[PDB]
Design a protein around this ligand. Structure first.
Ligand code: SIA
Ligand code: SIA
Ligand code: SIA
Ligand code: NAG
Ligand code: NAG
Ligand code: NAG
Lengths: 532, 532, 532
């Protein structure tokens, strides 16, 4: 046939057709469609602006650049999370506000399939949209998959705390992409009236935030947060961000006379100079020596007064805002391997004792934000269970996993439920055959493990057992059904109870069945510990 | 008595009076009147913007800078084309969007004399308005002469092929100048309702382009193309210009990640850095060794979708656009000396044989764009006439001259005629006494040789014979009469037949008389050869 | 005891409360309130633009930076003029368009106290608003004191003489600050309908200029010029400023091809680079060897055609403009110590003779602008009084003092009077106890000596005798009374005659009483000498 040419508001776009095994209707794929003017030069540290219209047919046939980030870590995360067989090597650029579209619709006719916009994770410091291939999900559940990109690290989250650089540029880009979907997705067989946003980790936190933001209202109709919500501390900076701004400014060789001066100076720096500063800051690794209360993990979401008017805690306390069906989930062992490995945790012994745990739990401050006075009690509650040093290690990993995702996620769901909107929860417990070889075979339900089911990895990568394939089909079905009706259930699928007062949730894995009061016991413990 | 002070829309302008031998009314001359905002910094590679208004009286008494170009070549061409006795040495600057005005009208009264706007040539790489002195033409034919400048080379034609740098900046400056004339020329005794545009070589091509462009519609009412039209290949880049953009970016020490990145990087380079890149690219000289299909002659006109919606060929096939009297001409020997000399052609032997000719005709690809398979037939059709090696040389020079100007010019004229608009053609055959000493005395009607007649060189430079003086008078008469009524004819002048179906044209020279079917035989030949 | 929080157009501002000895109602102080967008990058050498609005509560609790200037000289002048006990060390920055507000009004209620906007002096090269503490004045006279800042030196007065950089940026900032007062002062208990502008030295000349400018019309209703008016040559550049522009450009390592090129180049320079250029230019010190007619004192006010349509002289000759009560004053010995000391005058001998005088009066050209032919007559008229070499020194100082302030001030006052507007004059003769120790005890009424009475230094610094304290009270009374009714008089205060035809003025000092025809004899002499 002839390559797919869709006419968007800004101009014509030329994609390519790809057929999936066992599907007649080939899927139309468009790579690198600009949804905003390149945030270069003076546009750096300012809201994303509308893209300039193009005169003829634009070739959306090449993978776009991933936003500037640590090239090593960024690639590593892409190999570890990609659902396609061969990991696609990417390029770094400040010019990265693009989005990829995977539409199973027959463009030759009018279609309004539900739209699923994916927001990649990566601690808001690394990541890319190209990592995720939407071919399987689009074809299998007949939905339009849209993977978007947003400014990362300094470029997307630098904030002086005042009007000279409010911050949250990255989030504003996500909002900008959603508006683009509203104004263009129809030309791709998508229904702008049924847009579902879903992300994992930092992406889940992003979805969480968009759900609380007034700007994002009416740009989506369903939300899914996989392993990450707006109560995941490490990602949301509360307090005076001015010190961090000055520390970054100095590290980049910038004066700190005034806020206006810092932003101006940083806007003069080259993309490369800022990247070097990023590497000097050492943002994804854990700091061993020094003072834990000073170690800055990353540049996250802030309370800018535009995107967020107050803290996520304060915002979710009110119900005076528009609500939509929300699905919040976590994996069995969120801190099982992936994260600890990437941050270079001192767990090389395979075992830990009471004292060393308290020592680590303290240095883990930037991740769990647990006072040093609470350390004793917390460690006792989890590791005091047994004397087995190896069990204390795994229990220590549960400690962290719960503080970062378990409890935060459940509190978020509860508040969403009490606000009166349809809520759903799940706990993914499965070990994908696509796990890294360096990942211990005992770790099941590690961070990002559900990504292989959601994105139909079993149908793009080889070796998936009939069990894994079946699992992926189920998950995609649930996800797509949710995208369709704001309810995961559907014929031929295990019943998924709504997260109401009974607090029922679905345990997804080799044996998928409903259960109740997820992490109920832990949320209780931590709500008191943190209440000092 | 008192220097001329005209009030334009942007502010007052002060010029100077200059009397020509035999004319009572002194001519008011204004040099360097800004018609746009300096395209400095971020304005680089962007459409020309309105000039900022000034507060008092601006001195238009000094020659403006000529746009950044090869200083050596630019000066050389200026010396070779100037119609004034002493060649005026110019300065290079990115700040060059100015125009010069020569008005014979008595500013103390209301006058509405026909306006002639001159577009200098120079392969769109070099050239300047100051080269041309309009004093003689203005006084002699009582018309307002306006010599404009536009961005050359990289500065005025850099194109990434997309919306991040469409290209054709230079042309847009020309259109910007014409708009300036419309809103201001009346303050100088000019009739904005009778504006004629005329240019030579690259300027002849510009006039041809402007005639095809929707943007320049209604900014002129007659056009004259001397030795150059929109079908003169070398100047009109067809196909993917992306590679040339990247090759330039790299030579300037820039990344090529994306089009937006290239334009950003090139916008950071200093004028000097870009001038060095220009010189490294070696754009005016012919490449001897390597592959001819790769040798990029220059950065010409492109199909941006703004100035030109499709190719010149495609555009002239339609008659759904506004038309005006058009005069198209060529010189007897376009590739006689000047051009080959500036491009450093291997013709130092004064003689050529069948084999060497095919060899040269091939390396001349970027000029004639003749397939290597056609070379044999072409060389045979021209040099196969005799065995005289010296005659083969000259016949080779006609070969080129016809492909670049002869045939293109005649096709354009025919299309214009068939489109239903008043068309006129001419063939200038004369050897000005102002020719370079290094120019063989046998070459008559070389490139740019009519410039001395058109601009009345015989009345500014010395030694003109009464025959040459008389010829210049006649040419200026024809040109101004055309500028006046869209018809060259007038009492006291040889009848100039309209280029209608009989294809009558005027042969201007020592003996000026009508003729018919100019280059009719060659157009036929080349139309088939190129039809492969 | 809750810090004061005022809501301005652009956002909420948080200040601090400060109680003065003997005043119940504490004064609300706000430091560093932005009244314009930081003039960084491309905004350099362009008019001030509106400040971007802020999202929450901005802390106006830290002193803003002083505009880039000679750090050493700037600090010295701040120490010498400050009315607070401890001089506040400041920081340099291009980001300096801020203002400080001292309001005695009880914000919890609606107040419309008269507003006094202070413009600091410093030859338009140095100075800061923080130097002046409005606490005493605000409290003692119950008026809102506003100290503003404006661009200095190159940043605020660079002019190419054309539209590419008209100049007078600093003055435009002053007008920008006044508009801010109009749109916000009400929120601080101020009355936008009763705004009085007053400054000293360069600030006095600024007030004078604003009184002549059409742009500042309706932004103030009363004006006070202390030791400086628009006829103080040294600050107002008349003639072709192009040469100075080129000299600065070159000194900063910039081409001078064209005006647009110079401005572009200088815009690229870093604050530090321009600061270095400033120091190289050596603008506040006197040039000993070379040609006096070339020594450029500073970058002053120019006739841009925006702020000033013609020269101050020419402007005050007309009465077709809006007028307000104007108070013009001078000190007994304007060139007594401070100025000569800062400019490094060769007066280290304490005595001078007729010949050396003429020698100095010549090199003092950039200050007094006296022709070398007039030097003889002028020196004779002043120093010819006695043979005492020490008396000649002091008489020489009066010579200068009268040419720069005495005569200028009186001419301005007379014109203002004749123009039909309420005029007042005064001559301050008092030696503050806060004078520098290096200042001879014989100098009384030195430049800036009234600053300590006007700003109530006696109530912030220690050691003020009951005589000095009383003087300050009186002065502030006169000043505030003027700010209130456009007339200094009031009960319990010596009668201050209006400067009408009798030319009565007030001599302020240990003995304050009216007098007549101030400098009437000198104005006479100089009006002829300068009439050549
Ligand atoms: C160096 C030069 O040629 N520039 C000159 C410009 C011209 O107006 C423009 O360049 C276009 O001529 O302004 C002047 O002529 C002028 O107003 O007195 C002086 C200046 O030197
Ligand atoms: C603009 C740019 O330089 N990027 C690349 C694009 C990508 O698709 C972009 O992400 C979106 O066009 O692909 C091209 O081949 C294209 O023809 O558009 C050009 C280039 O290599
Ligand atoms: C880093 C610094 O010293 N700047 C200070 C600025 C000032 O407003 C400006 O410098 C003008 O005074 O912002 C603050 O006042 C503020 O809003 O909290 C505090 C901050 O410390
Ligand atoms: C876009 O794709 C078409 C064919 O699908 C091709 O002709 C064109 O060159 C491509 N554009 C580029 C150069 O990326
Ligand atoms: C140009 O203008 C200057 C001042 O702007 C003026 O003195 C003179 O009339 C002119 N000088 C020349 C001929 O450039
Ligand atoms: C402003 O003052 C408040 C107290 O009034 C304080 O909390 C804050 O830290 C200060 N500055 C900032 C960073 O907002």
């Amino acid at each position: 046939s002839s390559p797919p040419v869709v006419d968007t508001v800004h101009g014509k776009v030329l994609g390519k057709f790809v057929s999936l095994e066992g599907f007649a209707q080939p899927v139309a794929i468009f790579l690198g469609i600009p949804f905003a003017k390149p945030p270069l030069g003076p546009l750096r540290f300012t809201p994303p602006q509308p893209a300039e219209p193009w005169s003829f047919v634009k070739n959306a046939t090449s993978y776009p650049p991933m936003c500037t980030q640590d090239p090593k870590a960024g690639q590593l995360l892409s190999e570890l999370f990609t659902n396609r067989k061969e990991n696609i090597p990417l390029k770094l650029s400040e010019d990265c506000l693009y989005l990829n579209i995977y539409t199973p619709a027959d463009l030759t006719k009018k279609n309004r399939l539900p739209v699923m916009v994916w927001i990649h994770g990566g601690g808001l410091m690394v990541g890319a949209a190209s990592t995720y291939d939407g071919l399987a999900l689009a074809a299998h559940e007949n939905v339009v998959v849209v993977t978007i990109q947003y400014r990362l690290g300094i470029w997307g989250f630098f904030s002086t705390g005042d009007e000279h650089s409010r911050g949250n540029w990255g989030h504003l880009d996500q909002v900008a992409a959603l508006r683009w979907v509203q104004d263009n997705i129809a030309s791709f067989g998508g229904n702008p009236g049924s847009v579902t946003i879903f992300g994992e980790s930092a992406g889940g936190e992003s979805v969480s935030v968009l759900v609380l933001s007034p700007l994002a209202k009416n740009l989506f109709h369903r939300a899914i947060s996989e392993s990450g919500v707006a109560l995941t501390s490490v990602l949301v900076k509360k307090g005076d961000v001015k010190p961090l701004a000055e520390q970054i400014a100095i590290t980049a060789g910038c004066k700190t006379t005034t806020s206006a001066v810092m932003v101006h100076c940083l806007r003069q720096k080259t993309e490369e100079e800022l990247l070097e500063t990023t590497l000097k800051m050492k943002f994804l690794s854990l700091d061993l020596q020094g003072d834990p209360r000073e170690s800055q993990p990353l540049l996250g979401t802030v309370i800018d007064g535009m995107l967020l008017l107050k803290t996520p805690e304060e915002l979710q306390a009110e119900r005076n805002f528009h609500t939509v069906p929300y699905m919040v989930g976590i994996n069995k062992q969120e801190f099982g391997w992936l994260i600890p490995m990437l941050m270079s945790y001192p767990l090389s012994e395979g075992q830990l004792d009471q004292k060393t745990a308290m020592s680590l739990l303290w240095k883990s401050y930037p991740l769990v934000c647990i006072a040093k006075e609470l350390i004793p009690e917390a460690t006792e509650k989890y590791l005091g269970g047994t004397d087995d040093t190896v069990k204390k290690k795994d229990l220590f990993l549960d400690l962290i996993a719960d503080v970062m995702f378990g409890v935060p996620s459940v509190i978020v769901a509860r508040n969403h439920r009490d606000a009166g909107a349809p809520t759903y929860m799940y706990e993914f417990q499965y070990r994908p055959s696509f796990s890294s070889d360096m990942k211990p075979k005992t770790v099941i339900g590690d961070h990002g493990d559900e990504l292989f089911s959601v994105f139909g990895a079993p149908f793009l990568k080889e070796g998936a057992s009939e069990e894994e394939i079946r699992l992926s089909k189920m998950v995609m079905k649930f996800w797509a059904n949710f995208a369709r009706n704001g309810n995961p259930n559907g014929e031929g699928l295990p019943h998924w109870p709504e997260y109401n007062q009974k607090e029922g949730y679905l345990q997804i894995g080799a044996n998928t069945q409903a259960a109740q009061k997820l992490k109920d016991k832990e949320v209780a413990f931590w709500t008191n510990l943190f209440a000092k």
